[PDB]
Design a protein around this ligand. Structure first.
Ligand SMILES: C[C@H](O)[C@H](O)C1=Nc2c(nc(N)[nH]c2=O)NC1
Ligand SMILES: C[C@H](O)[C@H](O)C1=Nc2c(nc(N)[nH]c2=O)NC1
Ligand SMILES: [Fe+3]
Ligand SMILES: [Fe+3]
Lengths: 307, 307
């Protein structure tokens, strides 16, 4: 049985376990030839590397160049939310704009966003240097902890990023983590991953992809997007609700083994009846995972109870 | 419907609602003629009066006279716990002695005790000036918050106190609040009191008296004490498990209306099958309380959800 954190503080062991050679080092990366960008990324990586549970997330003064990139992404995407984003998203966005500083001329500080999420569902953020294993990233969700990037994409291509960056985290993920039902749903995924075999972790990663990242949900007699990858993608967000993509009901037995690529728009999306239904489906799927025990999270003591 | 806190911070409104003329002012009080004691009590009252949710509980340097009083109470009572106190009590006491400084020559600081309880069940302490109404005192339990006194009884009579004092809170209450089952049970009482009519509040106060204060519980084929009033009373603790008092099964419909006095040993005690059973009985009793709504506590956001 693979090791897993029993306390929220134990998530600290995750920092010393990431891909040390990030994407910013790749020749095809938008900022590859930018030494200033290289150092800025390293600066953000060090903040995450030195962060420890409990401490407030270090505030950072973003440069004008970075705020411009943010403004571009903010302005373009926001024009689609009212008609394409699920109710949960639109209901909370006005609140984020007023209490977290969500504006095109300002990049929200993770500390303020984390406090806001805590007040909403107890979800909190932890700055992350780079890509974590699926096991570690999903494990955090069990404690309602989202490993969040703080750096921003390179300014040369504001409408594109080969990795998650702050625009993605804040405009795509955060709004949904402010919803109780979604919070419980995402947490159910995290709980299912604790001590799960590597093979089932990959299955949960795939389920996560078709829900938290590119999921669509029913809303009355309509269908709306709730996936963070869709909500942070101007092109795919409009595409996902057109007649081009194929839509199928969310079915974990099938979804969990569905292949996909992160290079182009998804040809297929899974539609969740609701966040509560999706959560129940995850719970049922979790029961099929070979684990010599059962897990539960106790928010009172922030510990995982192993039975 | 009487007002009640919706957030743990709203408990702050309680400080401005206590009996401003405490027992230390009564002519028959052990320290009535002691001006030094009078001022010491006022000093402790001011700390509670200025305390606000979130802040750490101010540490206080106790005088040698006070530590002596504590040592006397500690030494005498402790000799009875192993044989008279319930398992939950004895299981946690060794831990309190090692991490909270529970020794006869040292009075534990409430801040350390609160941190300890939080790690155990999420229960926390809040210093309280004097006697709170039953509604306010029980309301706090809904948030797993115990209003705790910080002052100590007068040194002239270490084996006696006409009110709750720190020896009572720490040696009687605290150990039980470190148990998950008891924690949930006591909280169930607090939840039942939220917005309850004055008459049912008195009923919950009576139930509390026969459980949290002077309750006995079954333990295997034996019976042990768990009530804080018994655990902090050398005389009654031995008495409660002898053949003199009358014992009856815990039955809220009867217990809730049973009369009692706080001047002499209880002639009758109610025996709980267990803390979980008692909690279920409270829940059922709570359903009989005329309330145009249902309540639930969300530890994730520390708010009461009203349905
Ligand atoms: C969720 C699934 O495990 C997916 O492959 C991952 N996403 C992320 C990750 N790590 C970070 N920091 N952020 C992500 O969004 N590691 C793995
Ligand atoms: C529990 C029942 O409401 C009982 O009358 C009370 N106990 C207490 C109280 N207030 C304090 N501060 N401490 C207690 O132990 N107010 C009322
Ligand atoms: Fe993402
Ligand atoms: Fe008491």
């Amino acid at each position: 049985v693979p090791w897993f954190p029993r306390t929220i503080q134990e998530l600290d062991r995750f920092a010393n376990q990431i891909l040390s050679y990030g994407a910013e080092l790749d020749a095809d990366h938008p900022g590859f030839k930018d030494p200033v960008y290289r150092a800025r990324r390293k600066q953000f990586a060090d903040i995450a590397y030195n962060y420890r549970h409990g401490q407030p997330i270090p505030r950072v003064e973003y440069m004008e160049e970075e705020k411009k990139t943010w403004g571009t992404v903010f302005k373009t995407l926001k024009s689609l939310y009212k008609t394409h984003a699920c109710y949960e998203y639109n209901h909370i966005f006005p609140l984020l704009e007023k209490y977290c500083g969500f504006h095109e001329d300002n990049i929200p500080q993770l500390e303020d966003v984390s406090q806001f999420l805590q007040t909403c569902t107890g979800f909190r953020l932890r700055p992350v240097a780079g890509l974590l294993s699926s096991r570690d990233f999903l494990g955090g969700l069990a404690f309602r902890v989202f490993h969040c990037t703080q750096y921003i994409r390179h300014g040369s291509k504001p409408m594109y990023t080969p990795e998650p960056d702050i625009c993605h985290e804040l405009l795509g993920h955060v709004p949904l983590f402010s919803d109780r039902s979604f919070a419980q749903f995402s947490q159910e995924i995290g709980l299912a991953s604790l001590g799960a075999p590597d093979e089932y972790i990959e299955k949960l990663a795939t389920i996560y992809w078709f829900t938290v990242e590119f999921g669509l949900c029913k809303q009355g007699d309509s269908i709306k997007a709730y996936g963070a990858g869709l909500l942070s993608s101007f092109g795919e967000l409009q595409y996902c609700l057109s007649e081009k993509p194929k839509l199928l009901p969310l079915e974990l037995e099938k979804t969990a083994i569905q292949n996909y690529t992160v290079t182009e728009f998804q040809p297929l999306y899974y539609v969740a009846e609701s966040f509560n239904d999706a959560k129940e489906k995850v719970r049922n799927f979790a029961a099929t995972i070979p684990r010599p025990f059962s897990v539960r999270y106790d928010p009172y003591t922030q510990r995982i109870e192993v039975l």
